[PDB]
């Protein structure tokens, strides 16, 4: 059902820039499928399969996590730079009245437009996040381990396209732990 929900709910334009989820759910599978059976072979060959494979699975995670990553950011500074230049479009708009009736029918379509790509890219960081979570999930499952669920919080609990941190932020967090422990 993730896949599907994921599929269902995914921007067409940025098809290619979401978790290859899927592919994950398909990667797992051949795993099992191609799994070498202790009592066919030894403990170490089946040792080494498996390590082989989640040497692969991770650099598969930090590529994906990489494209999340890369296309947040560009995004999220391209929304900062519209915000800032529509806030000045206003103020110039709104000054210049005290027949630009039309001029502000652009501006309401550009906000309308702007908002519209905010909450298209709070729902890609939604899905993204929750397709990570879930994979990390079967990989751990499927695998009897906890390596994914390390990776996640690791690497996708501080992703930037997941969450923000100001430097300035984390310093006064970390003078407050430490003057109070």
Same mark, same amino acid.
């Given at each position: $059902?993730?896949? %599907?929900?994921? @599929?269902?709910?995914? #921007? =067409?334009?940025?098809? $290619?820039?979401? &978790?290859?989820?899927?592919?994950?759910?398909?990667?797992?599978?051949?795993?099992?499928?191609?799994? =070498?059976?202790?009592?066919?072979?030894?403990?170490? #060959?089946?040792?080494?399969?498996?390590?082989?494979? %989640?040497? $692969?699975?991770?650099? *598969?995670?930090?590529?994906?996590?990489?494209? &999340?990553?890369?296309?947040?950011?560009?995004?999220?500074?391209?929304?900062?730079?519209?915000?800032? *230049?529509?806030?000045?479009?206003?103020? @110039?708009?709104?000054?210049?009245?005290?027949?630009?009736?039309?001029n502000?029918?652009?501006?309401?379509?550009?906000?309308?437009?702007?908002?519209? @790509?905010?909450?298209?890219?709070?729902?890609?960081?939604?899905?993204?996040?929750?397709?990570?979570? $879930?994979i990390?999930?079967?990989?751990?499952?499927?695998?009897?381990?906890?390596?994914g669920?390390?990776?996640?919080?690791?690497?996708?609990?501080?992703? =930037?396209?997941?969450?923000?941190?100001? &430097?300035?932020?984390? &310093? @006064?967090?970390? %003078?407050?732990?430490? #003057?109070?422990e």
């Amino acid at each position: $059902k993730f896949a %599907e929900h994921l @599929s269902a709910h995914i #921007t =067409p334009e940025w098809r $290619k820039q979401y &978790i290859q989820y899927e592919a994950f759910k398909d990667m797992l599978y051949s795993a099992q499928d191609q799994a =070498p059976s202790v009592e066919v072979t030894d403990e170490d #060959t089946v040792k080494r399969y498996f390590a082989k494979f %989640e040497e $692969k699975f991770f650099q *598969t995670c930090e590529k994906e996590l990489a494209k &999340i990553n890369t296309f947040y950011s560009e995004k999220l500074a391209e929304a900062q730079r519209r915000f800032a *230049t529509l806030q000045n479009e206003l103020q @110039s708009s709104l000054d210049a009245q005290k027949v630009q009736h039309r001029n502000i029918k652009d501006l309401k379509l550009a906000f309308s437009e702007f908002y519209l @790509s905010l909450i298209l890219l709070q729902n890609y960081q939604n899905l993204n996040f929750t397709g990570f979570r $879930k994979i990390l999930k079967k990989h751990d499952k499927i695998l009897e381990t906890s390596r994914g669920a390390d990776w996640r919080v690791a690497h996708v609990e501080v992703a =930037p396209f997941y969450t923000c941190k100001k &430097i300035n932020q984390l &310093i @006064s967090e970390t %003078e407050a732990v430490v #003057t109070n422990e």
